Amino acid sequence: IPRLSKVNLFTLLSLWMELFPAVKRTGLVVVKNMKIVGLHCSSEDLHAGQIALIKHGSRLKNCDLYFSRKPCSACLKMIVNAGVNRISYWPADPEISLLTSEDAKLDAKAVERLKSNSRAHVCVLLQPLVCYMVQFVEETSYKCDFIQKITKTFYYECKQERIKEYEMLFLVSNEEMHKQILMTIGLENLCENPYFSNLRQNMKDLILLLATVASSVPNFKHFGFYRNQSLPQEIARHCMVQARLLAYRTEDHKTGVGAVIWAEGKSRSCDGTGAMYFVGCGYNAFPVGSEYADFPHMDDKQKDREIRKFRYIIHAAQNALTFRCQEIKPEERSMIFVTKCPCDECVPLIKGAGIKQIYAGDVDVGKKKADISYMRFGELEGVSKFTWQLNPS
Amino acid sequence: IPRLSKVNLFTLLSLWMELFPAVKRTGLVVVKNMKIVGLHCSSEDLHAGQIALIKHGSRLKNCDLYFSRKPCSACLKMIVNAGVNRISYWPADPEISLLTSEDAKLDAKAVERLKSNSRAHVCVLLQPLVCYMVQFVEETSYKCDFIQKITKTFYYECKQERIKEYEMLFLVSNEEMHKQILMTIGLENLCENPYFSNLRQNMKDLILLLATVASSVPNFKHFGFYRNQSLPQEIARHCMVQARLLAYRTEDHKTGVGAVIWAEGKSRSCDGTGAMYFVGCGYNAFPVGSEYADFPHMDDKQKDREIRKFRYIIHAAQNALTFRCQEIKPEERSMIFVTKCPCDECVPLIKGAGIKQIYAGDVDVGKKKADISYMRFGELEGVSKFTWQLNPS
Amino acid sequence: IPRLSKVNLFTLLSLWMELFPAVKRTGLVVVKNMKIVGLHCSSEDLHAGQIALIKHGSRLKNCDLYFSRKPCSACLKMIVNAGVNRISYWPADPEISLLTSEDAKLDAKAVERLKSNSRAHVCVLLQPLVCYMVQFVEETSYKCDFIQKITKTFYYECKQERIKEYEMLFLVSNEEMHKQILMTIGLENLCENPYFSNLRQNMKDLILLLATVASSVPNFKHFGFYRNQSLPQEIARHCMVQARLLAYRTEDHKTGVGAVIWAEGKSRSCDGTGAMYFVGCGYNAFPVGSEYADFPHMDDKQKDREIRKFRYIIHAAQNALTFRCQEIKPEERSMIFVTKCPCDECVPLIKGAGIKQIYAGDVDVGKKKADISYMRFGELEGVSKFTWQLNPS
Amino acid sequence: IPRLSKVNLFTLLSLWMELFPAVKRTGLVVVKNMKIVGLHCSSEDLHAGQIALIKHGSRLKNCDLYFSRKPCSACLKMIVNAGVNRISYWPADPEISLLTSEDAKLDAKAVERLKSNSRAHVCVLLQPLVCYMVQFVEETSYKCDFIQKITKTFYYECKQERIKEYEMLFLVSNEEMHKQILMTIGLENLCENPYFSNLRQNMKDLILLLATVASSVPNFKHFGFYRNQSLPQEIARHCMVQARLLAYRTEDHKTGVGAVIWAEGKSRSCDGTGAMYFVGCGYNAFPVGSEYADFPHMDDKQKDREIRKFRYIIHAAQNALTFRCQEIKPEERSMIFVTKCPCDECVPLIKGAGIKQIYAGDVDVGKKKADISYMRFGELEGVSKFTWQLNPS
């Protein structure tokens, strides 16, 4: 199966964070040592870069920041002063809108000057997807737990709606306006063909993949996460889409599973996500630093259990707990969103970590295979469980 | 005086952690930069490795883990994924008991496959003790504050009882069964003599040392820690034995002192120690990085006070506070267990650190020497003091 | 404009910390990677070094400690055990007073022995000031916001009073007594001229600068910080003087701004500052790692706005929040002291960081320049504001 | 078998380097990353420290230097300027003889002052040997290739001669004289019992071991290395003793083999070894970073060839070539001294490395075991071979 790249994952996550349910809004992904340490969105008061500064301080040192729009000079100077390594940005209309004029152009010039005189590398890191990536994402999106649950109780029309909305929000349809933006933000190297058309096509492909993933957890009928107090359904869908986007980084050759751990702070926060802050993320993969041939990749179809992937595969929730950027606070409401039903090996870890709520798929609940089972999720006590289903009330 | 090795200290501490008062139970010592950063025991729900993962996350990177039993494949894959440097284990029956069959053998095979394809080094690191180590430990154990206090108000009989119990728990008396276990867990290099007999003798010697140290703080008559609410006497004895085992790492040539700082969390935890979590450890030694001849080692017998050890020796409590892996929470109950009465330059440090309770011996209480005194412990206010004594009730 | 050096800033800050409003009292500055991570004062129970040990633990590794007095052997051994890099001290009467005898001399000998056999470098790092530095500091202090506010509603007389008091507290007027102290504390290389006279003159110049800066925020008439509950006026003045001292590290060629963030803990603390602990510090400067010609240094007088400093200069509050050594706890009272009224791009950052109180001089409040404005401080909601002012009561 | 420690090996090698065939003469061992990178001796013009400076330059950074005598102030200042980590010295009469007066005392005072004000750690690092190290060394020395070859064609009498000579050269028999030396060189912590007597006994034990090893390759009955031009027999014996001392660092449990590679430069050199300079050293051991139980330690007595040490043991010559500090220059004469006959997997490596001459023992020449053979040494062409033997003329 095709694998989404780390940088394209971070770009997609930054654009999706710009869509977190609450000068243009900006989503930001803070990555350290190729691990996500922050998911932020611009609020009405502060930009994503300012919020990242407030949240991280000097911990932004040697960090990679992925912005859904090019940050303003005020954000860029603070981010550079904090000591980050790379600032990758989505080359649409920047944070200070160029489609609104002289002040925005002056801000762009100041951003260029800051970039030219800093050790931080400000760049556009989005790369083309493989030829089959979009088709594979669509195939797995129609077949995921949530779409299957709705079907057993529409997807392409919602996907078309998401395509239109996200192409409006993230793309510059007018080629001349996009060329003007790219010239203003110092991307003259991408203003002439075939680089201009290649960049626009790559942006369109990434927007298509994002729309596919977002519609894989659709706002359809009364379907939501139900069955101690549930989150607003929009935020639950957004976090599930985050985990679903992570599921495409899987090293498993058959099934991709993603997991995001979020927590709700007691007090007010400066972030655009409100009291909710990102805690951890993960996908199912073999232990860090493993080559392709290091561990068996076969499923139960292989006769010898010793050469099956199950004893060696790290699950999405296990990776999310392992590489968490925040501690699970017992007094806070903490939620883990998993695209697949947590297995009997992961549920005790979630319970022991103190995670209060699990938002999960429901397809594999009750399955009992030789090396993996799903019996402890149905009978789990002390942790609230929310599954994709029709609203009982 | 003979000095206990760091690796043997960690092995003994993992074996003792397996005995913390509440698939076989497993103790675990997490060490970072040759400093202990975690003491864990398997609970009824989670193994020691899973608990260490939950408690540390990616902070296990480049850490040394010391297991009382060889971890299972599920624990090993998560520990390796976290990036640990070195997993040492006690070569008795592993976590998945081989003395119960096919599932345990398959788990051992998966553990060996994980070891072969990972940068983490899975090994048996226990070393032979010096010829005089056990005799010296026995001599100092009979002469310690607690045994002397009981005598001033039995030790060898309790020593024999602990020897029998710990040889039952930690050793495989049958040589053929031990050979089978070693072959299963991939220790064929130690299955034939003299390496098999050397390994068994080293294990027996370490178990004898552990029984000696555990008997030095015996469950005898109604003796316990008494004089705001005291811990259960079993946990207090266990922590005092931890500090006593640390006391044998001393650089002082005459008296070894050990100290352990523990804290009781307000909320429930996943660990087998309950709400109690390890905060810090220390022993009396010269400042880190000092050579043998760097500082004077003499005592008050030396005429010149300028060439006495007192002004240059770091006390056990000072080292426990310095290299603590956790912050002292003001709202939490925090306990420091010291094998000797805290001195007048340590009591203010304990009080200022916020440690609520001091469990200690009381032989030197009131002693006033030129370079060390014990006057501030008797008159200490704001910190609960628990000494080894008969129950006043 | 002349710039205060980092080592002189830290020496001055340690001397000022010794004067924090409540064996001689000692101030201590803990610096890591040329950033201040701790401001401590000796309490009645514990010395500054012991308090730094309690507060930081192993985080003192590779840290530079700046003491207002030479630490005692008990403090020095624990500090070098913690692994610090440099211990700079003010070469006046040490912590164990030599002007009071045999015990102090023995402590000094033990300190020298600890210094000889440790990798930590114990030294005197104070360096001569720039020739114009004192005159420039006097000129800017007379023209600072607080002195000007008093004038619009004395400074040299208060400066003379501070000169006398601080020369009494920090200098040894008798040359032979100072020579005895220097010989005892192992500074024989500075006991003969011109090095002895040069050291005494450097100390006098630094004391003069400290008196000037402390008089810039005088205890005059009923002037204090007023406008949810304010701090004691002495502590507010002390923190404002800290910020004023930081303002002389500015990279801006016209105006120096300093900011200190402190927090009042809920529970008792071992520090001499009481429940208050240092959170962060900063001054107005260009992004870290910038050369002199990297960014424009001009002001609004320059015609082109693209070559003005404003879009590239990091403000004092921005730097204080960026390089904070502590997290802003929502339940704690947090105060930021800034020598100039916070600008319109700093007030939202202070509000979003959770800082409860802003202490500031408000000369520029209401000013609206092209690239910087002060409109949001006057209308700021949710943050208590205290300005230099006559007491309204 | 007992294992000589790294630091005691380096101390013994520095003492032996002082005896290299040609203010007291000083031998010096330069070690980097626990590997020997230099063997130097004082010449008539330059001291060992000055020669090390000339030879290494800034490569002395973070190096450990082992001196047979405490270096003078001129040597010490240059060595600490070069940035070394540790200077361990043998605590006999220092480089500037204290047994000759005021100038030597002034030099010692300057050395102490340099040590006190430098991050380099000047110390005495010699450790006590295990209680049976000397007996094992004597047993293996009587049974070595050279002594056995002498017997098949005395040892204890030569051993007594070496004991007397080396106790005269390296020890201070007069206890009061040694106390005076130790006080002068700032070792007052080792001037009173039991530390004084312990240090003297440790020095005596190390001298006894050195005499044993040196007599294991004795100057006896015109025996030497014979069979294109051989070295002077004294230098060949000295290098063979170097390799023999390295042979006691072996990880093999039965047979210890050592190897030293030296090269004769074409031009004049400042070293006391003349044109000869140290190239590399090694002993037979398992691959670097291996635990005791990592690899099989068994020999041909074990039935299964897969669990024998031979396929996993790195030979002495292989380690000497691997961790060489100098390149083998084709135009220079190169000599490898190995305490055992080179095996069939070592001779091709020596030939391919360009080593011109092999000085070796010859007891195993012609032996052909299953996993190790000695057939290629007898028929080796293009490399001169010198064996312990009667002089043919």
Ligand SMILES: Nc1ccn([C@H]2C[C@H](O)[C@@H](COP(=O)(O)OP(=O)(O)OP(=O)(O)O)O2)c(=O)n1
């Ligand atoms: N809570 C879980 C459960 C599973 N996984 C990952 C790791 C598992 O190796 C993979 C599932 O692999 P299977 O071969 O069992 O896949 P399916 O469940 O899709 O298989 P099937 O439908 O054939 O039963 O998903 C995960 O990350 N988190």
Ligand SMILES: Nc1ccn([C@H]2C[C@H](O)[C@@H](COP(=O)(O)OP(=O)(O)OP(=O)(O)O)O2)c(=O)n1
């Ligand atoms: N609270 C304490 C007290 C002491 N120590 C350590 C450091 C001291 O140097 C050592 C005790 O050394 P003494 O020479 O004082 O030994 P004793 O306690 O045995 O004294 P005495 O000979 O009077 O019985 O123990 C410690 O770590 N913590």
Ligand SMILES: Nc1ccn([C@H]2C[C@H](O)[C@@H](COP(=O)(O)OP(=O)(O)OP(=O)(O)O)O2)c(=O)n1
């Ligand atoms: N809250 C603030 C406000 C300003 N500054 C810094 C930014 C600039 O480096 C400098 C102010 O520059 P100006 O040119 O505005 O200086 P003045 O205040 O002296 O301006 P004016 O000439 O109008 O009096 O102070 C700061 O650090 N924090």
Ligand SMILES: Nc1ccn([C@H]2C[C@H](O)[C@@H](COP(=O)(O)OP(=O)(O)OP(=O)(O)O)O2)c(=O)n1
């Ligand atoms: N040129 C060589 C030859 C051998 N060795 C080392 C590694 C070998 O593992 C060890 C020899 O191991 P054996 O068991 O073969 O020892 P002996 O040769 O002494 O055995 P025996 O006398 O029983 O034949 O010496 C070495 O370093 N360099």
Ligand SMILES: [Zn+2]
């Ligand atoms: Zn911005």
Ligand SMILES: [Zn+2]
């Ligand atoms: Zn799972």
Ligand SMILES: [Zn+2]
């Ligand atoms: Zn396990």
Ligand SMILES: [Zn+2]
């Ligand atoms: Zn003490």
Ligand SMILES: [Zn+2]
């Ligand atoms: Zn002190």
Ligand SMILES: [Zn+2]
């Ligand atoms: Zn500002």
Ligand SMILES: [Zn+2]
């Ligand atoms: Zn010299």
Ligand SMILES: [Zn+2]
């Ligand atoms: Zn060989």
